[PDB]
């Protein structure tokens, strides 16, 4: 898969299960059009966000719904969500893995880009 | 100041000077209204963002312009920008410190909230 | 595998290839005895550090040689190395994954523990 | 002060008060010699670690006692402790700020070095 997102819970030391991930694409008119949507599973990854034939070049926004993940566990988090905005496939096809690591009051993101 | 943002460079080990930071406030109408803006100075921070009587309750979005700091250094970074979205002063007035730690391909955000 | 370490490069957005990882075990006499040794490969993981039959309970030290990885690329890093000290298998058998994310002047570690 | 260490709590969003921090100095003989020690106060930092004429060139190891801060809060954390090992004042005198950001299962360290 061209796009992979991994979400980790830094307070409980495990993958963040059922975190909602929404991918959008900046559409011609500077509008963000909905491009993919999933919920992480056990592993911490949402399955099959896109395919290599639809994952065209563009500016994608990956938005992770962090608020809801810590409110169901009883914690009141600082952020409303986590988002990553990046230009993809501009210089040619790559595979991107976005890693988010969560804590009620901090989050880190890292991209690991590869040449298929 | 009620809102302070500190931006740091993890490649060269110093504060990121002249990063533009913009603060918006979600307006009645789900609209983001510009509410403050500044550049990081020698210490890694934009001065005077706002005042304790302007900083009222609301959903605030802090946008750090990441791409322009790495590009001026010869680096082609992953992210378009960095943004932090949080609900402020809900519970009563506090002092928020946002810290941003930058690398071409990764960034962390941490919030330190202080007593009303 | 019971023990897995993943090392990532936050400045170049890829796995850290050829990073030396040494695992020790606090031996009866508070001495650290050498327990395993590897070098990461493409993926960012050293292969086969230990087996489930030797990975007994104990206090393990995972030491990552970060200095050498950034000096060969021309950068002069802040830390001499990165280390993670943890108690393993105390409450029963688990699988531990240690993730280190690197930058000349910062590093983060995260453990993702699982019940085999 | 030439050496300042700031320790922060990522679960509750505040500085970690009363974390014990110890600084050692690798002695002639590859020996670690105790060289300073303190507890984080209300602001997340131990005061007076050392003085500009005691802080000379050398390999320094800063050890943050992580396990005891999480255990006093009812949390059973992953790491025994946190340590930062760096060569100081090599190149001439500078001011180092070490920041530690804690979560039960993850920690980050960042160094901010300032002009001789």
Place of tokens 């790491």: D79
Give all strands of the β-sheet with C79-88 in edge-to-edge order.
Answer: C31-39, C20-27, C58-65, C79-88, D79-88, D58-64, D20-27, D31-39
- Closest by Cα among C8, C108, A78, B112 to D100: C108
A6 is in an annotated binding site: yes
- Contact A109/B111, CB-based, under 8 Å? no
A41 is in an annotated binding site: no
8 Å CB contact between D66 and C71: no
**C113's tokens:** 């523990």
- Residues on C contacting D at a C-beta cutoff of 8 Å: 59, 78-81, 83-87, 105-113
In DSSP notation, chain A reads --EEEEEEETTTTEE-TT-EEEEEEEETTTEEEEEEEEEB-TTS-BS----TTT--SEEEEEEEEHHHHHHTTT---SEEEEEEEEEESTTS--EEEEEEEEETTEEEEEEEEE--
Query: What is the number of structural domains in chain A?
Result: 1
Measured between CB atoms, which of D80, D106, D109 is closest to C59?
D80
- Residue numbers in D near B109 (CB within 8 A): none
Closest CB to C79 among D79, D81, D85: D85
The DSSP symbol for D11 reads: T
Three-class SS state of D65: coil
CA distance C112 to C74: 32
Q: Which residues of B touch A (CB under 8 A)?
A: 59, 78-81, 83-87, 105-113
Q: Are the C-beta atoms of D85 and D24 separated by less than 8 Å? A: no
**E-only strand ranges, C1-116:** 3-9, 14-15, 20-27, 31-39, 58-65, 79-88, 95-103, 106-114
Element (H, E) at C68: helix C66-71
Spatial contact of D101 and D108, defined as CB atoms under 8 Å apart: yes
Residue D62 and residue D30 in contact, taking contact as beta carbons nearer than 8 Å: no
Measured between beta carbons, the chain D residues lying within 8 angstroms of C78 are 86, 111, 113
Q: What are phi and psi of C20, to 5 degrees?
A: -85, 125
Beta-sheet strand order (sheet of A14-15): A14-15, A3-9, A95-103, A106-114, B106-114, B95-103, B3-9, B14-15
- Asked if residues B107 and B67 have their Cβ atoms less than 8 Å apart, the reply is no
Partner-chain contact C81 D86, CB within 8 Å:
no
Q: How far apart are CA C101 and CA A111, in angstroms?
A: 11
Label residue C23 exposed, middle or buried (CB < 10 Å: 0-12, 13-18, 19+). buried
Q: Are B20 and B52 spatial neighbours (Cβ–Cβ below 8 Å)?
A: no
- Indicate the Cα dihedral angle C87, D31, D87, C38, nearest 10°: -50
- Whole domain around residue B110: which residue ranges? 1-116
Closest CA to D72 of D3, D20, D6, D7: D20
CA distances to C20, C40, C68, C70 from C74, rounded to whole Å, are 17, 19, 10, 6
- Distance (Å, rounded) from C-alpha D51 to C-alpha A5? 46
D108 is in an annotated binding site: yes
Q: Residue D105 is nearest to which of A10, A78, A104, comparing CB atoms? A: A10
Cβ–Cβ under 8 Å, residues C2 and C51: yes
Q: Which DSSP helix (H) or strand (E) runs through D66?
A: helix D66-71
Q: Which of C38, C8, C34, C25 is nearest to C109 (CA)?
A: C8
Q: Point out the residue among A12, A13, A105 whose CB comes nearest to the CB of D10.
A: A105
Which residue of B lies nearest to C78 if distances are taken between CA atoms?
B13
Pairing of strands A106-114, B3-9: unpaired
Taking the C-alpha atoms of residue C90 and residue C102, their distance in angstroms, rounded to an integer, is: 29
Q: Is C70 helix (H, G, I), strand (E, B) or coil?
A: helix
Q: SS3 of C34, please?
A: strand
Exposed, middle or buried by CB within 10 Å (0-12, 13-18, 19+), for D53? exposed
Residues D96, D108: Cα–Cα separation, whole Å: 16
The size of the B-D interface in CB pairs under 8 A is 25
Q: How far apart, in whole angstroms, are the C-alpha atoms of residue B52 and residue B56?
A: 8
- From chain D, the residues in CB contact with B13 under 8 A are 111-113
Q: Return the biggest CA–CA distance within chain C.
A: 44
Q: Which of A78, A101, A105 is opposite residue D106, by nearest beta carbon?
A: A101
DSSP structure string for B39-78: E--TTS--S----TTT--SEEEEEEE-HHHHHHTTT---S
Neighbors of chain A with 3 or more C-beta pairs under 8 Å: B, C, D
User: Which residues, including other chains, have CB under 8 Å from residue C48's CB and lie 6 or more apart?
Assistant: C1, C38
Chain B residues in contact with A83 (beta carbon < 8 A): 83, 85
Q: What's the rounded Cα separation, in Å, for the pair A98 and B106?
A: 9
Chains that touch B (3 or more CB pairs under 8 A): A, C, D
CA dist., res. D104 & res. A106, Å (int): 13
Q: Could you tell me if A67 and A79 are in contact, meaning their C-beta atoms sit under 8 angstroms apart?
A: yes
CATH number at residue B22: 2.60.40.180
Residue with tokens 């993958």: A15
Residues of A in contact with C114 (CB under 8 A): 14
Nearest residue of A to residue B58, measured between CA atoms:
A80
């Amino acid at each position: 898969c061209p796009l992979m997102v991994k979400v980790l819970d830094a307070v409980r030391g495990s993958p963040a299960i059922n975190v909602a991930v929404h991918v959008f694409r900046k559409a011609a008119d500077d509008t963000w059009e909905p491009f993919a949507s999933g919920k992480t599973s056990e592993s911490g990854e949402p399955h099959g966000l896109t395919t290599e034939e639809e994952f065209v070049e563009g500016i994608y926004k990956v938005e992770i719904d962090t608020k809801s993940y810590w409110k169901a566990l009883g914690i009141s988090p600082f952020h409303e969500h986590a988002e990553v905005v990046f230009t993809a496939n501009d210089s040619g096809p790559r595979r991107y893995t976005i890693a988010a690591l969560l804590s009620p009051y901090s989050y880190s993101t890292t991209a690991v880009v590869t040449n298929p």
